[PDB]
Design an enzyme around this catalytic site. Structure first.
Site, PDB file in Angstrom:
ATOM      1  N   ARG A   1      57.228   4.624  24.271  1.00  0.00           N
ATOM      2  CA  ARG A   1      56.420   4.837  23.070  1.00  0.00           C
ATOM      3  C   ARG A   1      57.227   5.141  21.796  1.00  0.00           C
ATOM      4  O   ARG A   1      56.858   4.721  20.695  1.00  0.00           O
ATOM      5  CB  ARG A   1      55.412   5.943  23.330  1.00  0.00           C
ATOM      6  CG  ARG A   1      54.479   5.594  24.454  1.00  0.00           C
ATOM      7  CD  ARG A   1      53.412   6.620  24.573  1.00  0.00           C
ATOM      8  NE  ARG A   1      52.363   6.220  25.508  1.00  0.00           N
ATOM      9  CZ  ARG A   1      51.375   7.023  25.901  1.00  0.00           C
ATOM     10  NH1 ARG A   1      51.310   8.277  25.436  1.00  0.00           N
ATOM     11  NH2 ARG A   1      50.441   6.567  26.734  1.00  0.00           N
TER      12      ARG A   1
ATOM     13  N   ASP B   1      41.377  17.108  16.032  1.00  0.00           N
ATOM     14  CA  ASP B   1      42.417  16.813  16.991  1.00  0.00           C
ATOM     15  C   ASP B   1      43.678  16.733  16.153  1.00  0.00           C
ATOM     16  O   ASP B   1      43.607  16.554  14.955  1.00  0.00           O
ATOM     17  CB  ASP B   1      42.151  15.451  17.634  1.00  0.00           C
ATOM     18  CG  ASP B   1      42.917  15.256  18.927  1.00  0.00           C
ATOM     19  OD1 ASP B   1      44.152  15.157  18.900  1.00  0.00           O
ATOM     20  OD2 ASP B   1      42.274  15.221  19.982  1.00  0.00           O
TER      21      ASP B   1
HETATM   22  N1  LIG Z   1      48.514  21.475  19.113  1.00  0.00           N
HETATM   23  C1  LIG Z   1      47.386  20.770  19.228  1.00  0.00           C
HETATM   24  N2  LIG Z   1      46.417  20.941  18.306  1.00  0.00           N
HETATM   25  C2  LIG Z   1      45.292  20.214  18.409  1.00  0.00           C
HETATM   26  N3  LIG Z   1      44.959  19.293  19.327  1.00  0.00           N
HETATM   27  C3  LIG Z   1      45.949  19.150  20.230  1.00  0.00           C
HETATM   28  C4  LIG Z   1      47.151  19.840  20.258  1.00  0.00           C
HETATM   29  N4  LIG Z   1      47.931  19.416  21.326  1.00  0.00           N
HETATM   30  C5  LIG Z   1      47.205  18.489  21.899  1.00  0.00           C
HETATM   31  N5  LIG Z   1      46.007  18.261  21.278  1.00  0.00           N
HETATM   32  C6  LIG Z   1      44.995  17.258  21.589  1.00  0.00           C
HETATM   33  O1  LIG Z   1      44.196  17.673  22.666  1.00  0.00           O
HETATM   34  C7  LIG Z   1      43.560  16.515  23.227  1.00  0.00           C
HETATM   35  C8  LIG Z   1      43.291  16.730  24.696  1.00  0.00           C
HETATM   36  S1  LIG Z   1      42.375  15.415  25.462  1.00  0.00           S
HETATM   37  C9  LIG Z   1      40.849  16.367  25.802  1.00  0.00           C
HETATM   38  C10 LIG Z   1      39.576  15.831  25.222  1.00  0.00           C
HETATM   39  C11 LIG Z   1      38.294  16.581  25.658  1.00  0.00           C
HETATM   40  N6  LIG Z   1      38.306  17.954  25.145  1.00  0.00           N
HETATM   41  C12 LIG Z   1      38.087  16.540  27.203  1.00  0.00           C
HETATM   42  O2  LIG Z   1      37.796  17.620  27.769  1.00  0.00           O
HETATM   43  O3  LIG Z   1      37.637  15.482  27.685  1.00  0.00           O
HETATM   44  C13 LIG Z   1      44.503  15.353  22.959  1.00  0.00           C
HETATM   45  O4  LIG Z   1      43.764  14.238  22.465  1.00  0.00           O
HETATM   46  C14 LIG Z   1      45.506  15.848  21.906  1.00  0.00           C
HETATM   47  O5  LIG Z   1      45.685  15.027  20.772  1.00  0.00           O
END
Ligand SMILES: Nc1ncnc2c1ncn2[C@@H]1O[C@H](CSCC[C@H](N)C(=O)O)[C@@H](O)[C@H]1O
Length: 274
Positions: free
Chosen positions: A43, A144
């Site tokens: 990536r 996000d």
């Molecule tokens: N420091 C941070 N601040 C905000 N979001 C974050 C983060 N680190 C990771 N994430 C985000 O957290 C997401 C988790 S995926 C989870 C999605 C959903 N809540 C579920 O339960 O289905 C990722 O898309 C990522 O971009």
């Protein structure tokens, strides 16, 4: 008729990998594993190429030098994990509808890790069904740290198979089906999309630019990428953002109470201010 291809093949050193891990940890709090290195490489080389670098050392320096560049966002987007689904941990939805039915006035919800939008739209559909679609009754704020997933969230386009958990009524009421080339695809109806606002918020900020307090905050399946100090820091920041009898929804494997005692369990991974 053979004409061997070969595009640029760079080398991620152990040292460089360790560097990438420190940087994303310091920036987004994400803790990477050694088994994600091939993924990290695949990536991130695309950034090297687009920028014309052939050295990971040079890439990391431009990043470390300029802490505010737009490249920091491409770096972050490359290393997050966005796995999600519509109505994931579905037991939370009947609880939310229950809570909303009581708290009259504006019911406000914050989805702290929206990913590609499945969670915030699940929340919107649940609220539209429970409270009805009427301006002023409820609103969903979703954020996000990843801008790639937020843009997809904002488009609201999904493939019809991703919606196996919706009833034929929800499908008809909240989505428009596609035909011709882009068929097997559906799009969230603008009417429902107007009730959710998307914004990028990095949870490690010491201050969040969010329209709180909230009646409910969904922080599911994200704390799992952070360590305990980081997790406790964030949880304490959620405290002032919750209305008196508000709900904090955690992911299936997360236990918040054990991090801050100001939170108390009330249901299937649902907490309340003690
Ligand atoms: N420091 C941070 N601040 C905000 N979001 C974050 C983060 N680190 C990771 N994430 C985000 O957290 C997401 C988790 S995926 C989870 C999605 C959903 N809540 C579920 O339960 O289905 C990722 O898309 C990522 O971009």
């Amino acid at each position: 008729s053979v004409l061997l291809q070969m595009t640029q093949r760079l080398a991620l050193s152990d040292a460089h990998f360790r560097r990438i891990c420190q940087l994303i940890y310091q920036r987004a709090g994400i803790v990477l594993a050694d088994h994600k290195r091939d993924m990290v490489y695949n990536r991130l080389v695309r950034r090297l190429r687009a920028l014309g670098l052939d050295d990971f050392g040079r890439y990391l320096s431009m990043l470390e030098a300029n802490q505010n560049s737009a490249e920091w966002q491409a770096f972050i987007n490359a290393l997050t994990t966005n796995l999600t689904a519509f109505f994931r941990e579905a037991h939370h939805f009947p609880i939310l509808a229950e809570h909303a039915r009581r708290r009259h006035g504006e019911y406000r919800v914050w989805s702290a890790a929206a990913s590609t939008g499945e969670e915030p739209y699940s929340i919107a559909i649940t609220l539209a069904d429970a409270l009805g679609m009427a301006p002023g009754r409820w609103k969903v704020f979703a954020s996000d740290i990843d801008t790639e997933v937020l843009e997809k969230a904002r488009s609201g386009i999904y493939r019809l198979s991703e919606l196996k958990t919706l009833s034929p009524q929800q499908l008809q009421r909240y989505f428009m089906r596609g035909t011709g080339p882009h068929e097997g695809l559906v799009r969230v109806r603008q009417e429902l999309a107007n009730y959710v606002e998307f914004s990028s918020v990095n949870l490690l900020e010491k201050q969040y630019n969010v329209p709180g307090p909230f009646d409910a905050i969904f922080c599911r399946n994200v704390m799992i990428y952070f360590d305990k100090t980081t997790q406790e820091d964030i949880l304490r920041r959620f405290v002032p953002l919750l209305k008196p009898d508000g709900l904090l929804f955690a992911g299936h494997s997360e236990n918040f109470s054990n991090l801050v005692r100001e939170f108390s369990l009330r249901g299937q991974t649902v907490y309340a201010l003690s």
